[PDB]
Paper text:
Poly(ADP-ribose) polymerase 1 (PARP-1), an enzyme that modifies nuclear proteins by poly(ADP-ribosyl)ation, regulates various cellular activities and restricts the lytic replication of oncogenic gammaherpesviruses by inhibiting the function of replication and transcription activator (RTA), a key switch molecule of the viral life cycle. As a molecular mechanism for the promotion of viral lytic replication by vPIP, it has been proposed that vPIP interacts with and sequesters PARP-1, thus disrupting the interaction of PARP-1 with RTA and reducing the amount of PARylated RTA. The results elucidate the novel molecular mechanisms by which oncogenic gammaherpesviruses overcome repression by PARP-1 using vPIPs.
Here, the structure of MHV-68 vPIP was determined at 2.2 Å resolution. The structure consists of 12 α-helices with characteristic N-terminal β-strands (Nβ) and forms a V-shaped-twist dimer in the asymmetric unit. Three regions, L1 (amino-acid residues 175–176), L2 (amino-acid residues 231–237) and Ct1 (amino-acid residues 280–301), were not visible in the electron-density map of the crystal, suggesting that these regions have high flexibility. MHV-68 ORF49 directly interacted with PARP-1 in solution without any other cellular factors; this action was found to be conserved in ORF49KSHV, thereby prompting us to propose a new name for MHV-68 ORF49: viral PARP-1-interacting protein (vPIP). The N-terminal β-strand region (Nβ) and α1 helix (amino-acid residues 2–26) turned out to be critical for the nuclear localization, PARP-1 interaction and molecular function of vPIP. In contrast to vPIP ΔN, the vPIP mI mutant with alanine substitutions of Phe5, Ser12 and Thr16 is defective in function and in interaction with PARP-1, while maintaining an intact sub­cellular localization, suggesting that these three residues on the surface of vPIP are critical for its function and mechanism of action. Furthermore, a recombinant virus harboring alanine substitutions of these three residues showed severely atten­uated viral replication both in vitro and in vivo, suggesting that the interaction of vPIP with PARP-1 is essential for the ability to facilitate viral replication. The vPIP homologs of MHV-68 and KSHV share low sequence similarity (∼20%), with an r.m.s. deviation of 2.2 Å from PyMOL and a Z score of 24.5 from the DALI server, but they have highly similar structural configurations of multiple helices, despite the introduction of unexpected mutations in the ORF49KSHV structure.
Author numbering:
A (entry chain A): 3 to 174, 177 to 230, 238 to 280
B (entry chain B): 3 to 174, 177 to 230, 237 to 280
Write the structure that this text describes.
């Protein structure tokens, strides 16, 4: 269950756990520094991929719709699918609203009673998803809720993780599970659309880069409380951290990781 | 550990392994595909980075040189350090030779016997690393040359890996080992230089992309020679993905394909 970005709260909690369990304050700082190196590296990956995420998700719903075509029985049904599919190809300002009306209209065909629940423009995603999902056990709903109710975006699960749960929605290729998957992926698309327009990933990355600097500093000040190896390695870290403001790239993160491993091993003995 | 790219030869081995292990021809195809999906995905991650790789590696060496200046007993040693550093900054046509003669010469300061040792530019890089490493055990030599001797670029290790074995070399921090390390990074730099000059990662990405796309076609045939059939659906999906992959060769697509191959395994096992 990888994250697109983890919340600050999760990280502060992780740091506390580390503070409570490493004795050596220099170790502890170094653990936190690994943890932060990983995160900023993943987050850099995720940001470099970001400009492709919503195009990709558009095309994914289209495929899924394209698979739904095989289960069509009515000409209304297929016309809803065509509207949805085609919409997903262009930039209508109301794409996201139409994707949800669209999804409920499909659901209407197979079950007409559902159609006179009133469409709430501003109803939260996870609440829509919960509403229109059918025949899903309460453990799945929970997981889905933990993913879709992400505390006003304090975190965001990643694409691969949402794929993993879509596969668990599939357990015998009938229409209902078909429309379940559509609900899920439209939800997920709504959520990523907000998360990408607001640029939450950029924000998170800035914050955690800050946090990452603040611990390199914190590590110097800690070691300055005990001209050999440490001080070469610390100059490396410093140079690395330094270059990281020119070039936030994965290569730089790989050196920082091994540099950190560098110190941990030295300080063990 | 991890490869900048693997050899076809190794993958061909994993395949034959799979082929004899797996009950079904379908099952086998899918494993093969899962292996090829990871590999292609990793190789695209690597090729997006490659434009940054040589600049990074230079910048690393420059760093090691400044560090060695803390240990510059002599002013000759200093003058060479400066010369190597100016050379990495200029990134000239002569760089690699600048690096090699530099290194051999810093070494010569430590012990002059070293300077009578014959070598050339066409000599394989691992051979050169072996000569010029001082007192490292038959243990170190073995792994180094397995990294460095990559059998005429059949495979390449990635940077994370070369870093990893750098660490296991910073063992005793003297002039001596600070030169072993210089040597190793010069050697590594020369390998990646040739690798990037010669576009071996792109080559390997193209082959492995062919090899993945064509085994998807194989799987489709195979499956057929045996609407609400979730196989036929996943298969159709799989096909759309592969087709998109050829115009947007990107990590989100590989991720969708993986989940989809897993789906396909899960269903056929029944």
């Amino acid at each position: 269950d990888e994250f697109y970005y983890p919340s600050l709260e999760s990280v502060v909690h992780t740091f506390c756990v580390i503070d409570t369990r490493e004795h050596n304050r220099v170790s502890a700082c170094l653990c936190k520094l690994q943890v932060l190196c990983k995160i900023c590296q993943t987050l850099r990956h995720n940001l470099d991929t970001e400009p492709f995420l919503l195009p990709h998700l558009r095309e994914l719903i289209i495929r899924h719709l394209t698979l739904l075509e095989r289960l069509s029985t009515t000409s209304k049904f297929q016309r809803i699918l065509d509207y949805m599919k085609l919409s997903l190809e262009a930039n209508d300002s109301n794409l996201l609203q139409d994707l949800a009306i669209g999804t409920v209209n499909l659901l209407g065909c197979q079950s007409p009673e559902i159609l006179s629940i009133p469409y709430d423009k501003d109803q939260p995603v996870h609440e829509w998803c919960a509403c229109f999902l059918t025949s899903v056990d309460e453990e799945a709903l929970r997981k889905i809720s933990s993913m879709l109710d992400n505390k006003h975006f304090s975190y965001m699960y990643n694409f691969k993780t949402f794929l993993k749960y879509s596969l668990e929605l599939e357990t015998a290729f009938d229409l209902s599970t078909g429309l379940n998957v559509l609900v899920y992926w439209v939800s997920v698309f709504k959520l990523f659309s907000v998360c990408v327009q607001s640029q939450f990933l950029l924000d998170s990355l800035v914050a955690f880069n800050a946090l990452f600097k603040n611990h390199v500093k914190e590590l110097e000040a800690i070691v300055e409380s005990d001209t050999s190896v440490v001080w070469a390695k610390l100059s490396n870290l410093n140079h690395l951290l330094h270059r990281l403001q020119t070039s936030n790239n994965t290569l730089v993160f790989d050196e920082i990781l091994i540099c950190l491993r560098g110190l941990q091993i030295y300080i063990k003995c």
